[PDB]
Amino acid sequence: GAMGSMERASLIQKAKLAEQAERYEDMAAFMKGAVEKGEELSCEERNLLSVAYKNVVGGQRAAWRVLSSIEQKSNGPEVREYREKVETELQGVCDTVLGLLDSHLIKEAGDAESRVFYLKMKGDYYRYLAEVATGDDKKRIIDSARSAYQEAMDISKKEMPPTNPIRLGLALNFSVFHYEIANSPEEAISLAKTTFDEAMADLHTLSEDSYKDSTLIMQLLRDNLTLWT
Amino acid sequence: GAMGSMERASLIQKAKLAEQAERYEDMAAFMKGAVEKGEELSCEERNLLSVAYKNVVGGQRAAWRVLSSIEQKSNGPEVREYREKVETELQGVCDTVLGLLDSHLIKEAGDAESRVFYLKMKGDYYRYLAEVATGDDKKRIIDSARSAYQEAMDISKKEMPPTNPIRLGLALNFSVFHYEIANSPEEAISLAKTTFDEAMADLHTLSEDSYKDSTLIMQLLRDNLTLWT
Amino acid sequence: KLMFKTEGPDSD
Amino acid sequence: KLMFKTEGPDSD
Ligand SMILES: *CCC(=O)Nc1cccc(-c2csc(C(=N)N)c2)c1
Ligand SMILES: *CCC(=O)Nc1cccc(-c2csc(C(=N)N)c2)c1
């Protein structure tokens, strides 16, 4: 692509600069260029990739929800056309992230920290597709999200402690997938409770900084449980 | 352009939808398409054009300032290259707005409300160019901003009451142009004081709603004077 | 729509 | 940089 001529280190440096400047579309393009160099990503670089696309897709989701709400209230073709435009752009961003994961981030990820990270991302971007999907397409997209989250959960349970922030963020997202995508609120509440309780019991093993990292995500599980129960 | 096939009314409707969705780049593209239909803009449509590009250029200015600050602290080519990338994009947005004003919004604007509005925009987008300009280019850009603000001020003083929100927003912006672009802080303070005092004396003529509109901008003149004196 | 807590930047 | 008050959306 357009980043083919730039050094991998220069693309990482510019991704960090774009983050400081709140230029998330540029940040995502720099990280897509870094991934396409073909080398595996470090933990910081995986985080840069994820923060970039999360901010990009976040703006699209927030816009899509405003438009869908106006369209539902209206039920001229303009509202539908514009909601479709934003939807197609959101789908394009998800297909881009999923394409990076499939070519070839996941297959080259052998360590649990990298493999769980990428599989959780795969679950998340299929979940964003499911938020805008309708009918049969929706069913298959939902199963793809479920499959990626499930594989990530299996690895996380075997290879990481229950306080691992990656394991905690995965369980949090899989719980929200269950609650509002899979229409399995009981599964969602069960997963959030078990995850919170198993992390609580392992907090005594952590340093002051690791404790802060784990408790931050546990508070998210608690916020959801408060609204669900 | 890409909006050539869409109805003018459809472009205005989609600009309003994009505003609700906080999709300002889309809002600007819809309004650029509406202007290029060749018809004059109503007051609401002029406001849609201005809010769209102000939000777009605002993100670019905020990013440019973060990058310029990092570059100055660093004094590798990456910081300079990326600050240049954002700068060129900001300059492109200003050239786009200035091109719409010059082809042919200003020449077709005969009423004071439309003519002052467009000339103030011309002043503002040359001011945004001046914020990033260096040396001799900077001098000519500064004179172009000054010339547009001056022509807008002359018309506003002759054709609008001192509480007119367009007249007030023009004087506010021209005052900031004087303070930090033209390095004329005394001119800035004089203009802000006179404008505030002349509007204060005309408030008694206004309805409850017009009073709210005028006092909102007068508070901005006061905020600047508080920091300047 | 009421959005539940998910991992990372709350960008929506 | 300290930015002074200007007309419309404070988008920067
Ligand atoms: C997995 C190990 C780890 O967290 N390593 C690491 C090192 C340095 C910086 C980061 C990091 C996390 S989020 C972030 C960002 N938004 N720029 C950077 C991670
Ligand atoms: C000059 C007369 C005037 O203000 N007319 C008018 C009518 C309806 C709506 C607006 C307006 C101002 S800002 C705005 C927006 N951000 N969408 C819309 C103005």
Side-chain angles (χ1 to χ4, degrees), chain A residues 19 43-44 46-48 51 113:
Chain A
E19 187 179 24
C43 182
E44 175 169 16
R46 289 196 296 275
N47 275 257
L48 288 167
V51 168
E113 273 204 298

Side-chain angles (χ1 to χ4, degrees), chain B residues 15-16 19 27 42-48 51-52 113 117 166 213, chain D residues 9:
Chain B
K16 291 172 189 181
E19 187 179 24
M27 187 188 180
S42 67
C43 182
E44 175 169 16
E45 297 163 348
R46 289 196 296 275
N47 275 257
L48 288 167
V51 168
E113 273 204 298
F117 191 98
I166 308 164
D213 292 338

Side-chain angles (χ1 to χ4, degrees), chain B residues 95-220:
Chain B
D95 292 334
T96 293
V97 174
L98 295 165
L100 297 171
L101 293 169
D102 198 56
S103 298
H104 296 90
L105 288 174
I106 289 165
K107 73 173 56 54
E108 287 317 312
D111 298 348
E113 273 204 298
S114 64
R115 198 166 182 88
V116 172
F117 191 98
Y118 298 134
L119 289 165
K120 173 191 164 288
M121 286 192 78
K122 180 169 184 167
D124 292 343
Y125 286 84
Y126 271 117
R127 168 162 60 88
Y128 306 149
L129 285 174
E131 283 182 343
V132 309
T134 50
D136 292 327
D137 256 330
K138 199 192 189 180
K139 282 185 176 177
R140 272 187 255 266
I141 289 162
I142 288 172
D143 203 59
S144 283
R146 190 188 311 273
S147 186
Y149 284 137
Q150 190 62 67
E151 190 185 343
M153 288 287 294
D154 301 332
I155 303 162
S156 78
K157 292 216 247 184
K158 289 180 190 80
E159 303 296 337
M160 291 149 127
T163 48
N164 184 285
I166 308 164
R167 181 173 165 175
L168 293 177
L170 169 57
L172 175 68
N173 291 9
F174 195 22
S175 179
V176 170
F177 165 82
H178 283 133
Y179 196 89
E180 63 178 16
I181 310 299
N183 189 42
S184 298
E186 285 165 344
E187 187 68 17
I189 290 158
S190 189
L191 177 58
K193 285 170 151 175
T194 291
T195 303
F196 183 95
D197 288 344
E198 285 198 275
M200 185 60 69
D202 187 57
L203 291 176
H204 76 270
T205 71
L206 310 179
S207 67
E208 191 164 82
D209 305 331
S210 294
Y211 179 89
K212 182 194 157 290
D213 292 338
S214 296
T215 59
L216 186 100
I217 304 158
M218 290 168 69
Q219 187 54 59
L220 306 173

Side-chain angles (χ1 to χ4, degrees), chain A residues 206-218:
Chain A
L206 310 179
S207 67
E208 191 164 82
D209 305 331
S210 294
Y211 179 89
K212 182 194 157 290
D213 292 338
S214 296
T215 59
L216 186 100
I217 304 158
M218 290 168 69

Side-chain angles (χ1 to χ4, degrees), chain B residues 85-100:
Chain B
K85 183 194 182 148
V86 176
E87 189 173 295
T88 301
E89 288 182 20
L90 171 52
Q91 290 168 329
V93 170
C94 295
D95 292 334
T96 293
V97 174
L98 295 165
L100 297 171

